[PDB]
Amino acid sequence: TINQLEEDSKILVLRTKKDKTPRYVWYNSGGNLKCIDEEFVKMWENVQLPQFAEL
Amino acid sequence: DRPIDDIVKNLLKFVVRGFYGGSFVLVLDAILFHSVLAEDDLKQLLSINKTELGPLIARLRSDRLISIHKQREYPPNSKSVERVYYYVKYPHAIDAIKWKVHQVVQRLKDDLDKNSEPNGYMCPICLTKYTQLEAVQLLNFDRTEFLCSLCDEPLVEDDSGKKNKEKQDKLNRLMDQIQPIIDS
Amino acid sequence: LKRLIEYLKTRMKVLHVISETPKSFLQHLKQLTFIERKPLRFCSERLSLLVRTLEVTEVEDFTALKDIATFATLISTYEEGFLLIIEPYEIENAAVPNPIMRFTCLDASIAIKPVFERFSSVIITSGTISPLDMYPRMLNFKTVLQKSYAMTLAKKSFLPMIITKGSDQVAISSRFEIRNDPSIVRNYGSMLVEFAKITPDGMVVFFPSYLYMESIVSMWQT
Amino acid sequence: RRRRLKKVEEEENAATLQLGQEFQLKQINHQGEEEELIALNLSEARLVIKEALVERRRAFKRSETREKELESIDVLLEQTTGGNNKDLKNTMQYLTNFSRFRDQETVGAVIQLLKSTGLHPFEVAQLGSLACDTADEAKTLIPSLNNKISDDELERILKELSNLETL
Amino acid sequence: MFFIKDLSLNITLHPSFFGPRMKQYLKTKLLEEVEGSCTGKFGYILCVLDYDNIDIQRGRILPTDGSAEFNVKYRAVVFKPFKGEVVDGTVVSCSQHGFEVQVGPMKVFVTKHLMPQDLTFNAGSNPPSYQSSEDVITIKSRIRVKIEGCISQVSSIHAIGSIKEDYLGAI
Amino acid sequence: NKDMCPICKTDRYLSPDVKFLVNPECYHRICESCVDRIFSLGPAQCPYKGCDKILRKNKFKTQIFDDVEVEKEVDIRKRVFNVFNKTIDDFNGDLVEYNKYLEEVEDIIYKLDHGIDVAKTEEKLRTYEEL
Ligand SMILES: [Zn+2]
Ligand SMILES: [Zn+2]
Ligand SMILES: [Zn+2]
């Protein structure tokens, strides 16, 4: 039930790196979790900050 | 509460759900729920190891979705440590979101423009590229094939221009996905 | 009509004040839209005929078309004594700009000239028309006699008084930029209080503008 | 003289009239004074090169149809100059093929007709070189001519260039 | 395009040519080192103008080589291509990568990506050519082409052509 | 959309460099960056889906009016009135004949706008501008 709630994006849960075992569930106050594709995620990852006070 | 606070909370939630993993979502949602949150507070709520929150907090600070305070107090047992507080700076965070998505759009335009100049060629033996401008310095005496300057091998065709429509489609799929971000 | 309205929409997207003649407006409209003055002069009549034989039940959508036809006929048949003012800001207090287009009649004698051409005997009359020689110049008409009567009274029935300062000799004025001056507002309030105490039945207080009255009454209540 | 690196500059493009810092409109000659940049059309270049070759043949001695023109300039070339004349032979052949005007009076008429316009030397040499027909074709062949010459003036000057075209 | 420019060259004379006709030897080495020589700074230099009066000043002896260095200033006709410039020419070679057009002393290679899509290679023809629905481009064919790219080395210049714009192509 | 360029998918908000470039043959909300990316190398077909008209780079211009139909109507009106410029002086004061000429001009402008008789009206326009 936690699983289909997770792909329904109704709850938030973290899983272990060895296996996808739910241990602690929260409420998804935001929207759906898979809106942004993974290559856009890395494409977002590709950029960085020069400094602080200019912006 | 305040409607602009609701909008910036949903914007931070959307960007952490989109460009970041589930543990990042949990940490930033905890920051948005409890306004300030120390390291033991994140540990108590999320059951997350110090080494596990390491990359999470490092990424969130390097993107300025959360910021840190280095205040130490004086507890009655006098076992004081320089604890750290994690909270959110709303204007710096939203300005970081604008700058990141804006310049991401900018060099996506740069990448599709670089695709939009014609493809040129590349030598499979030496794994070096040679555009059309300098391939004509490397054409043969038979005036048929471009020969490599080092390998002396006929140049093969690249694919910078066959994927221009694919890059345009990827740009479109980025934009319709980030429409809530621009509306916020 | 649609291309005229679109030309008006293009004309209102100007970030500064335009003060232009109807002849210049017609020349610009002709060079950018190919609309002449003569088809514009029949615009209201043509719209009325078209609406009549369309026999429409609802005209709430066509009220703005009446506005456009009225504007077109006015700015087409009138070129001297009129002026078009395009303002990027209708009000300066608003955050978002709201453009406005005003076709204004600068000559008050234009609307009254056919009256004096038609009627032989006109008696311009007012209780408080002064100065009398201003009006035969300001409106182009000739007057056979202009006079103001002095009322004969056994006792002086009315007391006109000009108060230039408060009770404590602080000067009083109603110019719009110092309307928030506490001394002047307090002096006006004290004046109104004393006059309300010593006036038996009624008392009418006239203010230079509604915004001035709103501000000074609100801070009087404060 | 300043010693800045000044490595940033715009790419040399014919449409923007950027021909490089040493193909500017003013050129300091060997006598020291400034002079307008001498830009030649194809027929003008052919006549200047032929005049130089016959003057050099005169100096060496003292010290028309396409078929006869090609052999005459070939004998002139081999009589005048010595080695490494592949490039010069190709220029001579190219100019005698694509030479719009034959003689000095017609070509000088082209220079004075284009100097009546008061236009850029690159642009007038392009007009004298390209065998254009219409004004819009001239504008799309030379993007440098945009917002420079009116359409009626362009079409008439190309009309008498078409009239001056011979053989 | 063809230009006329003031040019200066440092030329080296071997000591064997230190005779009474050293100026004549200087002018002849100016000829067979400048005429037809390609430089990327000043374009293809074709012919030397004003041969009767060529500016030759005093020539410095090199302190180790022993040869004389003359800074000769002269007038010459040059040919420098530029990006975005329309020139006419004739095709001299064809291939599946493209075809070269001969303008002046320079071969401009037009790639196969820079023709209209109706125009296709035909290697079965002798010579191999490019054929379309309305025209054919072969060897020794008059053709108008726009140069949209130029590379210039110290001693070589190569250009890229395209005929995808309207009112270009064969004449 | 009236705010963003659908071809390059850029909002006016984050990218203020987009402009209201259209073409007389097909009126498309397309930006200057898209125009310079596509049509600078050569003429091409309309990048918006469902349209494949050939069009040139030098024919692009900015749209004056907000309505596409009004913009194309005034452009067609210009393309008619450039060769049709008879006035009351050309008709020698014949007011009814001048009115009938204005009727014919508005008829052919409406026909070119709606494409109902585009071939015959184009033929008539050509054989009347040849004189
Ligand atoms: Zn290689
Ligand atoms: Zn665009
Ligand atoms: Zn289209």
UniProtKB/Swiss-Prot annotation, chain A:
Record's subcellular location: Nucleus
| Other information | Present with 1150 molecules/cell in log phase SD medium.
Q: Family per UniProt?
A: Belongs to the TFIIE beta subunit family.
What is the protein's known function? Recruits TFIIH to the initiation complex and stimulates the RNA polymerase II C-terminal domain kinase and DNA-dependent ATPase activities of TFIIH. Both TFIIH and TFIIE are required for promoter clearance by RNA polymerase.
Assembly and oligomerization:
TFIIE is a tetramer of two alpha (TFA1) and two beta (TFA2) subunits.
Q: What is this protein called?
A: Transcription initiation factor IIE subunit beta
Query: From what organism does this protein derive?
Result: Saccharomyces cerevisiae (strain ATCC 204508 / S288c) (Baker's yeast)
Q: Output the lineage of the source organism.
A: Eukaryota, Fungi, Dikarya, Ascomycota, Saccharomycotina
Q: Which residues of the full protein are shown?
A: 220 to 274 of 328
Curated annotation (Swiss-Prot), chain C:
Here the disulfide bonds are none
Q: Where in the cell is it found?
A: Nucleus
Taxonomically, the superkingdom here is Eukaryota
Phenotype reported upon loss of the gene:
Essential, it cannot be deleted.
Its assembly, as annotated, is: Component of the 7-subunit TFIIH core complex composed of XPB/SSL2, XPD/RAD3, SSL1, TFB1, TFB2, TFB4 and TFB5, which is active in NER. The core complex associates with the 3-subunit CTD-kinase module TFIIK composed of CCL1, KIN28 and TFB3 to form the 10-subunit holoenzyme (holo-TFIIH) active in transcription. An additionnal subunit, TFB6, plays a role in the dissociation of the SSL2 helicase from TFIIH after transcription initiation.
Q: Which function does this protein serve?
A: ATP-dependent 5'-3' DNA helicase. Component of the general transcription and DNA repair factor IIH (TFIIH) core complex, which is involved in general and transcription-coupled nucleotide excision repair (NER) of damaged DNA and, when complexed to TFIIK, in RNA transcription by RNA polymerase II. In NER, TFIIH acts by opening DNA around the lesion to allow the excision of the damaged oligonucleotide and its replacement by a new DNA fragment. The ATP-dependent helicase activity of XPD/RAD3 is required for DNA opening. In transcription, TFIIH has an essential role in transcription initiation.
Sequence similarity: Belongs to the helicase family. RAD3/XPD subfamily.
Q: Additional info?
A: Present with 14400 molecules/cell in log phase SD medium.
Q: Which organism is it from?
A: Saccharomyces cerevisiae (strain ATCC 204508 / S288c)
Curated annotation (Swiss-Prot), chain D:
Compartments in which it is found = Nucleus; Cytoplasm; Cytoplasm, P-body
Cleaved signal peptide residues = none
Give yes or no: UniProt keyword Cytoplasm: yes
Primary localization: nucleus
What InterPro entries does this protein's entry cite? HRDC-like_sf, RNA_pol_Rpb4/RPC9_core, Rpb4-like, Rpb4/RPC9, Rpb4/RPC9_sf
Q: Which UniProt keywords apply?
A: Acetylation, Cytoplasm, DNA-directed RNA polymerase, mRNA processing, Nucleus, Phosphoprotein, Transcription
What's the domain of life for this entry? Answer: Eukaryota
Which molecular-function annotation in GO is an example for this chain?
nucleotide binding
Pfam families the record matches:
RNA_pol_Rpb4
Q: Name one GO cellular component term.
A: RNA polymerase II, core complex
Which Gene Ontology BP annotations are present?
DNA-templated transcription initiation; mRNA processing; nuclear-transcribed mRNA catabolic process, deadenylation-dependent decay; positive regulation of translational initiation; RNA-templated transcription; transcription by RNA polymerase II; transcription elongation by RNA polymerase II; transcription initiation at RNA polymerase II promoter
SUPFAM superfamilies assigned to the protein according to its UniProt record, in alphabetical order = HRDC-like
Q: PANTHER family of this UniProt entry?
A: DNA-DIRECTED RNA POLYMERASE II (PTHR21297)
UniProt similarity note: Belongs to the eukaryotic RPB4 RNA polymerase subunit family.
Name of the protein in its database record: DNA-directed RNA polymerase II subunit RPB4
The beginning of the lineage is:
Eukaryota, Fungi, Dikarya, Ascomycota, Saccharomycotina
The gene name reads RPB4
Swiss-Prot record, chain E:
An example of a Gene Ontology BP annotation on this entry?
positive regulation of nuclear-transcribed mRNA poly(A) tail shortening
Protein name, UniProt field: DNA-directed RNA polymerase II subunit RPB7
Q: Any idea which UniProt keywords this protein has? A: Cytoplasm, DNA-directed RNA polymerase, Nucleus, Transcription
Organism field: Saccharomyces cerevisiae (strain ATCC 204508 / S288c) (Baker's yeast)
Q: What is its main location?
A: nucleus
Indicate the quaternary assembly: Component of the RNA polymerase II (Pol II) complex consisting of 12 subunits. RPB4 and RPB7 form a subcomplex that protrudes from the 10-subunit Pol II core complex. The RPB4-RPB7 subcomplex probably associates with TFG1. Interacts with NRD1 and PAT1.
Q: Which domain of life is it from?
A: Eukaryota
Detail the disulphide connectivity of this chain as listed in its UniProt entry: none
Gene Ontology MF: a single term = single-stranded DNA binding
Where it sits in the cell: the answer is: Nucleus; Cytoplasm; Cytoplasm, P-body
Looking at the UniProt record for this protein, which Gene Ontology cellular component terms does it annotate, in alphabetical order? Answer: cytoplasm; nucleus; P-body; RNA polymerase II, core complex; RPB4-RPB7 complex
Which PANTHER family does its entry note? DNA-DIRECTED RNA POLYMERASE II SUBUNIT RPB7, DNA-DIRECTED RNA POLYMERASE II, III
The UniProt entry, under SUPFAM superfamilies, shows:
N-terminal, heterodimerisation domain of RBP7 (RpoE), Nucleic acid-binding proteins
Q: Which SMART domains match?
A: S1 (SM00316)
UniProt cross-references to InterPro entries, sorted A to Z: NA-bd_OB-fold, RNA_pol_Rpb7-like_N_sf, Rpb7-like, Rpb7-like_N, S1_domain
Task: Name the Gene3D superfamilies on file.
Answer: Nucleic acid-binding proteins, RNA polymerase Rpb7-like, N-terminal domain
- Describe the family membership recorded for this protein in Swiss-Prot or TrEMBL: Belongs to the eukaryotic RPB7/RPC8 RNA polymerase subunit family.
